[PDB]
UniProtKB/Swiss-Prot annotation, chain B:
Protein name as catalogued: E3 ubiquitin-protein ligase HUWE1
Tissue: Weakly expressed in heart, brain and placenta but not in other tissues. Expressed in a number of cell lines, predominantly in those from colorectal carcinomas.
Subunit annotation: Interacts with isoform p14ARF of CDKN2A which strongly inhibits HUWE1 ubiquitin ligase activity. Interacts with MYCN, POLB and CDC6. Interacts with isoform 2 of PA2G4. Interacts with NR1D1. Interacts with AMBRA1. Interacts with HAPSTR1. Interacts with HAPSTR2. In hepatocytes, interacts with PAQR3; the interaction promotes PPARA poylubiquitination and STUB1-mediated degradation.
Function: E3 ubiquitin-protein ligase which mediates ubiquitination and subsequent proteasomal degradation of target proteins. Regulates apoptosis by catalyzing the polyubiquitination and degradation of MCL1. Mediates monoubiquitination of DNA polymerase beta (POLB) at 'Lys-41', 'Lys-61' and 'Lys-81', thereby playing a role in base-excision repair. Also ubiquitinates the p53/TP53 tumor suppressor and core histones including H1, H2A, H2B, H3 and H4. Ubiquitinates MFN2 to negatively regulate mitochondrial fusion in response to decreased stearoylation of TFRC.
Similarity remark: Belongs to the UPL family. TOM1/PTR1 subfamily.
Organism: Homo sapiens (Human)
Domain comment in the entry: The HECT domain mediates inhibition of the transcriptional activity of p53.
PTM: Phosphorylated on tyrosine; phosphorylation is probably required for its ability to inhibit TP53 transactivation.
Disease involvement: Intellectual developmental disorder, X-linked, syndromic, Turner type: An X-linked neurodevelopmental disorder with highly variable clinical manifestations. Common features consist of moderate to profound intellectual disability, delayed or absent speech, short stature with small hands and feet, and non-specific but recurrent dysmorphic facial features such as macrocephaly, microcephaly, a broad nasal tip, deep set eyes, epicanthic folds, short palpebral fissures and a short philtrum. Patients may manifest other features, such as hypotonia, seizures and delayed bone age.
Localization: Cytoplasm; Nucleus; Mitochondrion
Length: 1429, 177
């Protein structure tokens, strides 16, 4: 536009700017970066114009341009920075890279001169004063950081060269020479008037910028007001700067008011304002400069915006002068702008007083001015139903905003009847009739002034109809094109809510077919920019949703309209169907924006139907047959392939869900199923294979599409791909309607899916699923670079039509995504349908879904397959699909589905897929298959998925305990017990066929872990299922250890599952079997340790390198791979079997062997530290942890033994602590016996019921928790295989080894284990002394962050405390602790009330709090507690 | 490659061993470094003197970020631990000595960081035998003399004076109430 014309004209430049964006601002930033390093005047014009452009990269240059000798450019930079800080926070948000250099130059300009009190008042700086009435220090420099210059005149030349000469003569602080330059150029200036005024003005600007973003003082307001009083009239630019400063200072206001005098009619500011106004009105009196008058009316605006100023503007009666302005001022653009300023001030003043305005007839003055301006537009655009100059449009806008505000204000409610018998409606009639000459926000203001008036006086709507203003509004909002903007669209229904209000208005509104026109907005590209989400953060379709909710409010006020509204909605849908059906349109992301139409219409319909939740709109819409046009939108041929994943498909699904959940109506599902069945019946050619050496049907339908550049964009070019992407959209709608928690909606969904049509669809979807797994895996086999196929023309014949590799891949990828995304949506649908089915027709739905599972597991390709991998990749997703459908999250089955999966089939097929995958179709037996060299590539991945499914299928703790059980009762009753019998029997044989063979290259540790989990579940389960073949599990548990240790050699991470398997075989068998296991593990450890003890005899003869070989031989020998799992297994076994395994570890003497190995490896590790190539033997941490738990166990056994020595084994009285009374109250005899028996068994927790309340005891904490409330209460037991533990000669060697492993920083996890062991050992001060005498605190301080772990600083602090706590210091600290606990009623996690006086003080509880101290040292704790309690 | 026990952690550790064990505070108070024991040591000086002078003051170049907060914790612990007068008297005497040393120090941001950090430690200590000692040693009078040992034009001077006023207000209140 004309901005562009000015740009082309400029691109004599300075002459054009004197007459008066990106590349113009870039040329400007150029010359800015040029001038600051016939030039200055170009810079000045660039600045003076830019200070208009910003008012409707330079910064770093402008800051440097402040270093100017000619203040004109400093002033222009300041005027630009004021325009910035005034309008937007552009310089406030900036970073301190240049914000501080800027603000500091501004501060050095702004800072005070001494004011009146030192003879530097601004008034005196503006009057000449002869230059001899100022302080002699004016023409003087005194800059310190020391420079002083008495007078600047004998060197008056070149102030810039003065500053540079002072740079050379003195070292001026770096980056702060600006305060010197500004003082020096000021002292040059002050000699003369222009330069003094320019310094004054620059200072005032700098103030104002520093306040819009120490400078201010008591005299500043009085100085500014005295600058304004100066009557030489040659100062108007200084007066305008002073007013703009006062304005900045408004944001002292009472002082501004006291000085300016606004509190009275006579007063300097009011009088000045009235003289400005009178000079503006009357031609004779010369007019006050435009800038000055603008500063006056901006100060009045900002002053009125604050209550103290509005009250002052009341008091001086400025409303009379401003109404004088709005009545008598002329028509020229500047006078219009002063009128709009006066209007906005009369607005601010009327937000707190009306009486002056009313007494001055201000509403009549406003209405006359609105008539005059509309009459001046009437010449340009005389049309009235039977471009506007911006300043006049802004006047009209502010004045209509005032009239709207007044109508919404009391003090006009008496009398506002006489607004619409004025001229006003005749001038609104012109704005409404010319929404293209006047802006759309002005046409909006006009219709909102009518709407607000009609809501204040609905009676006089008859008068507005009599003069036809409503009949002009109707024509302008319906028949004439609506101006396309969010606010106008948002308001039309509220306008019609007014125009209907008289019943005659309703008749006239419904006469002109309003909704056929109003709704066309949603199908029109002209209004799509209005529909697009604002801020990019409001919802998709937010504006159509608002419009719909407003039409809902409208037709809930006016129910007669409901039927026509839903008729026009249904015509919208029928037209979207038309635009999607015929070939001539093509959806753009002739191009048509169909997906945006579908999103906007659906957000509109959703809002309408779901707003009131009264099901009157849903009923009307469904009864007018709108669900056919709605549900057809999913199937539209020319919708894109990526439609089903789109927000427009989720919108259609949401409208269907809203209709379902409001109306409880099956008809949405019935119609969706009819149309889905219609689409599924179209693509049966996808089910029929090539019946020749051939690849994909989708790729034979594509390839045979001639040579069309993009076949997939045409519904005739790719009918099956577009039926795929229609079915996908329907399936995503059924997903959305299944994701429903209303049991009634679940029931009617299931009743529909259980129908004859529901099961016809579900059968066709099942065959589609298997077809899509085939097509997707073939397509990926063809996009693979001739690797998966066996050098065969399986799908090449069609790729040769399709077509150097990417040219074919990028044509298939739309097929692959259209088929893989649909498969995933089918799987989601079937999972949701299982959920709905489980929680009569559900039983047929489940039947068809388990027939799908059977079909997927028993599917066999056509006999032209080039490799079994297509079957193994079908099987992997059939298995991964059957898992979600038989088992919930939390792995509990659905017993309906397990019943039908067993009876129908799919269990025999599940296990046949394992037999097929190992035997390769009977080519090799299953027992040889796994280990066979030519086993297919994906047979480990299949077996991982199969084993992960069977692990879920076998578990009795979920299969028997599943929440989703059938009820107890003609039909065959399910038994999860017989299901587990047949499943464990079938699984065991397959595991046999995998028990000992070597593992697969990948997917061998997940195979091993799921196989071990299956064995665990079987071994735990036969004890429970024989309750309601045992010798096979017996012989297995006999021979299994060779396989367990093969797994520990091949796949160390399985050791936790091997431990759990061994523990279940033990809990099946006797201690005679526990001993055999533990002694065999210990003998394996024994030989693996003794070979490493022989691996580290010092290398005297040098036969081996003795450096790299020996250091890494300790870490890499096979034996050193064994120990890392043989010890770890023994440790897990120890943790469960606490005392048997301790007694075996003692009696074998293995602990001596491990101490000797820890000692003998230290020379090796030390030499490795001296190579600076330490690589820690991973087996070290198992040994330290085994020793740790051996001595943990022995501590504890001695304590438990001497605890048993003080208890009667019969009816050990357990007592629970009543904090309120402080009593250890007994349990019932049956509860006490239960708790005692389960403590003696060593169970961590025991459940019991008292008073029908559920209590549980936690022996880790010894707490009874009430399970309903969660209240935790303390408990006690009322008192009335000897593990020798580590001997001194072992502990001494361990301490030395742990210090040496701290010396050489072995590894983080090994330091953690060795420090844990040191922490246990050093709790005896003798060994703490040993650990501190071996200089371990230096090593600990030297340790680098490469050798650190989460617990390091706690653990090290505890170790140092163990060194510090000698018998006496420990005694004194234990005294401190005992006294503290007895004196302070400490709280606890047992609901012992904080600062209680019963519960917090019982000896039997205090000893429980002090338990950590008793463990720290029980003997000392006795001595202390005897002496201090 | 960074050390795993930075001086911050070592300070928190010592603060804990002071707060638990009576003798540790007295042993730390009496312990003193020796000439040429470390790069930062110029002559025989106490551990409390080093913590007050080199570790406690904020400095713009990190070695450990939170050394000063934890030297403040360490000296707080060495005060709070009653330890009779063995620990508290040597703490107070050394804080007074480090104040007088920093006031005699040449005008520098090193001087203002030391001064501000000593005011912060007096304020944290102050938040009753410590107050009795601060009175007996004339610490309040050495705080009041702080501006005598400033250049009153320095851009730091107001911040160090604010810091020295902060314990003076609390102490004058606690005395004269």
């Amino acid at each position: 536009a004309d901005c562009r014309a000015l740009i082309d004209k400029l691109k004599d430049e300075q002459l054009l700017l004197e007459l008066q964006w990106v590349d113009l601002l870039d040329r400007f930033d150029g010359i800015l970066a040029d001038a600051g390093q016939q030039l200055k005047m170009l810079l000045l014009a660039v600045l003076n114009f830019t200070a208009l452009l910003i008012e409707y990269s330079s910064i770093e240059h402008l800051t440097t341009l402040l270093a100017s000798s000619d203040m004109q450019v400093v002033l222009a930079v300041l005027n630009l920075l004021y325009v910035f800080s005034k309008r937007s926070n552009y310089i406030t948000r900036l970073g301190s890279d240049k914000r501080t250099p800027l603000l500091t130059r501004l501060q050095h300009l702004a800072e005070s001169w001494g004011g009146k009190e030192n003879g530097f008042g601004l008034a005196e700086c503006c009057r000449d004063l002869h230059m001899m009435k100022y302080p002699p220090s004016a023409t003087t420099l005194h800059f310190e950081f020391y420079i002083h210059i008495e007078q600047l005149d004998k060197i008056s030349e070149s102030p810039s060269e003065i500053m540079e000469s002072l740079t050379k003569m003195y070292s001026i602080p770096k980056d702060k020479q600006m305060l010197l330059f500004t003082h020096i150029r000021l002292a040059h200036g002050f000699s003369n008037h222009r330069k003094r005024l320019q310094a004054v003005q620059a200072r005032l600007h700098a103030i104002s910028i520093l306040v819009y973003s120490s400078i201010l003082y008591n005299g500043l307001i009085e100085e500014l007001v005295d600058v304004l009083q100066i009557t030489d009239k040659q100062l108007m630019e200084i007066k305008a700067a002073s007013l703009r400063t006062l304005t900045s200072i408004v944001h002292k206001l009472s002082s501004i008011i006291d000085c300016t005098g606004t509190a009275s009619y006579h007063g300097f500011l009011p009088v000045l304002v009235r003289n400005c106004i009178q000079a503006m009105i009357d031609p004779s009196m010369d007019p006050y400069p435009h800038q000055f008058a603008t500063a006056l009316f901006s100060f009045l605006y900002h002053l009125a915006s604050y209550d103290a100023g509005g009250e002052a503007l009341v008091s001086c009666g400025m409303m009379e002068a401003l109404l004088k302005v709005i009545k008598f001022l002329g028509d020229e653009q500047d006078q219009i702008t002063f009128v709009t300023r006066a209007v906005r001030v009369v607005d601010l003043i009327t937000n707190l007083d009306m009486a002056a305005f009313q007494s001055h007839s201000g509403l009549s003055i406003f209405i006359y001015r609105l008539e005059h301006e509309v009459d001046l537009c009437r010449k340009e655009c005389p049309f009235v139903i039977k471009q506007c100059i911006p300043q006049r449009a802004a006047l009209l806008k502010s004045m209509l905003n005032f009239l709207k505000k007044a109508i919404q204000d009391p003090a006009f409610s008496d009398g506002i009847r006489h607004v619409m018998d004025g001229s006003l409606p005749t001038s609104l009639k012109h704005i409404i009739s010319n929404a293209e000459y006047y802006g759309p926000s002005l046409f909006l203001l006009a219709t909102e002034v009518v709407t607000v008036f009609v809501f204040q006086e609905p009676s006089l709507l008859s008068s507005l109809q009599d003069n036809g203003l409503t009949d002009v509004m109707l024509h302008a909002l319906l028949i004439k094109d609506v101006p396309a903007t969010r606010e106008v669209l948002g308001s039309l229904p509220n306008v019609f809510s007014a125009l209907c209000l008289n019943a005659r208005g309703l008749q006239s509104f419904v006469q002109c077919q309003p909704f056929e026109r109003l709704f066309k907005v949603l199908l029109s590209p002209d209004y799509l920019p209005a529909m697009r989400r604002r801020r990019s953060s409001d919802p998709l379709g937010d504006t159509a949703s608002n419009l719909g909710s407003a039409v809902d409010e409208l037709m809930r006020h006016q129910p007669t309209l409901k039927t026509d509204a839903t008729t026009a909605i249904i015509k919208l849908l029928e037209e979207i169907c038309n635009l999607g059906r015929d070939p001539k349109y093509i959806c753009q992301k002739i191009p048509i924006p169909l997906m945006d139409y579908i999103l906007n219409v659906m957000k509109f319909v959703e809002s309408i139907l779901s707003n009131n939740t009264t099901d009157d709109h849903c009923q009307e819409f469904v009864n007018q047959k709108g669900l056919l046009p709605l549900v057809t939108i999913l199937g539209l041929p020319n919708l894109p392939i990526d439609f089903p994943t789109s927000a427009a498909c989720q919108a259609v699904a949401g409208v269907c869900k809203s209709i379902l959940t409001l109306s409880h109506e099956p008809k949405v599902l019935q119609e969706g199923l009819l149309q889905l069945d219609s689409i599924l019946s179209s693509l049966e050619p996808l089910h029929r294979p090539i019946e020749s050496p051939g690849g994909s049907v989708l790729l034979r339908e594509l390839a045979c599409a001639g040579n069309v550049a993009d076949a997939t964009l045409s519904a005739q070019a790719t009918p099956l791909l577009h039926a795929l992407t229609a079915a996908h959209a329907y399936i995503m709608m059924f997903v959305h309607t299944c994701r429903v928690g209303q049991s009634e909606i679940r029931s009617i969904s299931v009743n529909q899916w259980g129908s004859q049509l529901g099961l016809s669809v579900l059968s066709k979807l099942s065959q589609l699923y298997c077809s899509l797994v085939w097509e997707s895996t073939v397509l990926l086999s063809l996009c693979t670079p001739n690797s998966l196929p066996s050098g065969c023309e399986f799908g090449q014949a069609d790729m040769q039509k399709l077509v150097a590799m990417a040219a074919r891949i990028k044509q298939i990828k739309p097929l692959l995504s259209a088929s893989s995304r649909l498969g995933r949506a089918l799987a989601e649908l079937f999972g949701l349908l299982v959920k709905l089915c489980v929680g009569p027709a559900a039983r047929s739905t489940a039947s068809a879904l388990t027939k799908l599972l059977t079909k997927g597991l028993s599917w066999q390709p056509p006999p032209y397959t080039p490799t079994p991998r297509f079957r193994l990749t079908f099987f992997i997703c059939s298995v991964g699909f059957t898992s979600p459908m038989l088992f919930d999250e939390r792995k509990y089955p659905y017993h309906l589905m397990l019943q039908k999966f067993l009876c129908s089939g799919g269990h025999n097929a599940l296990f046949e897929t394992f037999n097929w995958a190992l035997s390769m179709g009977g080519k090799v037996p299953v027992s040889e298959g796994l280990e066979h060299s030519d086993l297919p590539d994906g047979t480990g991945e299949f077996l991982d998925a199969w084993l992960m499914l069977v692990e879920k299928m076998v578990n009795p703790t979920t299969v028997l305990e599943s929440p989703h059980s059938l009820p107890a009762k003609n039909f065959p009753q399910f038994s999860a017990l017989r299901f587990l019998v047949v499943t464990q029997k079938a699984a065991f044989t397959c595991i046999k066929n995998l028990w000992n063979r070597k593992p697969l290259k990948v997917y061998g540790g997940r195979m091993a872990e799921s196989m071990l989990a299956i064995l665990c579940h079987i071994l735990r389960g036969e004890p429970v299922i024989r309750e309601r073949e045992q010798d096979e599990l017996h012989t297995f548990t006999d021979t299994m250890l060779p396989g367990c240790f093969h797994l520990l050699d091949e796949l160390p991470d399985t050791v936790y599952r091997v431990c759990d398997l061994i523990m279940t075989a033990i809990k099946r068998n006797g201690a005679d079997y526990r001993d055999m296991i533990l002694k065999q593990v210990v003998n394996q450890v024994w030989e693996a340790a003794d070979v490493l003890i022989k691996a580290a005899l010092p290398l005297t003869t040098s036969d081996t390198k003795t450096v790299s070989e020996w250091i890494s031989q300790m870490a890499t020998l096979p034996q050193a791979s064994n120990l890392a799992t043989r010890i770890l297994l023994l440790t897990l076994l120890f943790e469960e079997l606490k005392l048997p395994c301790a007694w075996v570890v003692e009696s074998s003497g293995i602990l001596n062997v491990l101490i000797k190995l820890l000692e003998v490896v230290q020379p090796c590790l030390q030499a490795a530290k001296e190579q600076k190539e330490v690589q820690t033997p991973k087996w070290i941490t198992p040994v330290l942890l085994l020793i740790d738990f051996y001595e943990k166990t022995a501590i504890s056994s001695k304590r438990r033994a001497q605890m048993t020595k003080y208890l009667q084994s019969n009816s050990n009285n357990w007592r629970w602590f009543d904090d309120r009374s402080g009593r250890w109250c007994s349990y019932s005899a049956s509860n006490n016996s239960t708790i005692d028996s389960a403590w003696k068994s060593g169970e961590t927790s025991v459940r019991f019921t008292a008073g029908r309340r559920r209590y549980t005891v936690q022996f880790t904490t010894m707490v009874q928790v009430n399970e309903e409330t969660g209240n935790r209460r303390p408990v006690m037991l009322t008192l009335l295989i000897l593990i020798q533990g580590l001997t001194e000669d072992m502990v001494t060697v361990l301490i030395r080894a742990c210090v040496s492993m701290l010396g050489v920083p072995v590894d983080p996890d090994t330091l953690h284990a060795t420090l844990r062991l040191c922490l246990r050992l050093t709790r005896d001060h003798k060994y703490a002394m040993m650990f501190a005498e071996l200089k371990s605190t230096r090593m600990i301080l030297n340790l680098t962050q490469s050798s650190g772990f989460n617990g390091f600083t706690p653990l090290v602090t505890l170790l140092l405390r163990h060194i510090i706590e000698d018998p006496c210091t420990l005694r004194h600290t234990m005294e401190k602790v005992v006294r503290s606990a007895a004196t302070s009623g400490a709280g606890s996690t047992t609901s012992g009330v904080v600062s209680g006086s019963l519960g917090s003080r019982e000896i039997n509880y205090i000893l429980r709090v002090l338990g950590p101290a008793a463990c720290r040292n029980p003997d000392i704790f006795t001595e202390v507690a005897n002496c201090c309690i | 490659s960074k050390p795993l026990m930075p001086t911050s952690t070592i300070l928190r550790l010592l603060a804990e061993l002071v707060r638990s064990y009576v003798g540790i505070a007295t042993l730390i108070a009496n312990y003193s470094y020796t000439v040429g024991q470390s790069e930062l040591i110029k002559e025989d000086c106490s551990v409390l003197a080093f913590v007050l002078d080199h570790l406690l003051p904020h400095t713009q170049n990190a070695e450990d970020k939170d050394t000063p907060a934890l030297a403040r914790l360490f000296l707080a612990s060495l005060a709070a631990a009653g330890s009779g007068t063995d620990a508290q008297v040597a703490l107070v005497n050394e804080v007074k000595a480090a104040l007088g040393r920093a006031l005699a120090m040449a005008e520098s941001t090193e001087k203002h960081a030391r001064l501000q950090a000593v005011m912060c430690i007096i304020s944290t200590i102050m938040e009753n035998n410590i107050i009795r000692l601060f009175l007996k040693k004339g610490l309040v009078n050495d705080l009041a003399r702080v501006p005598h040992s400033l250049d009153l034009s320095s851009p730091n001077m107001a911040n160090t004076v604010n810091a020295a006023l902060k314990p003076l207000e609390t102490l004058s209140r606690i005395v004269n109430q």
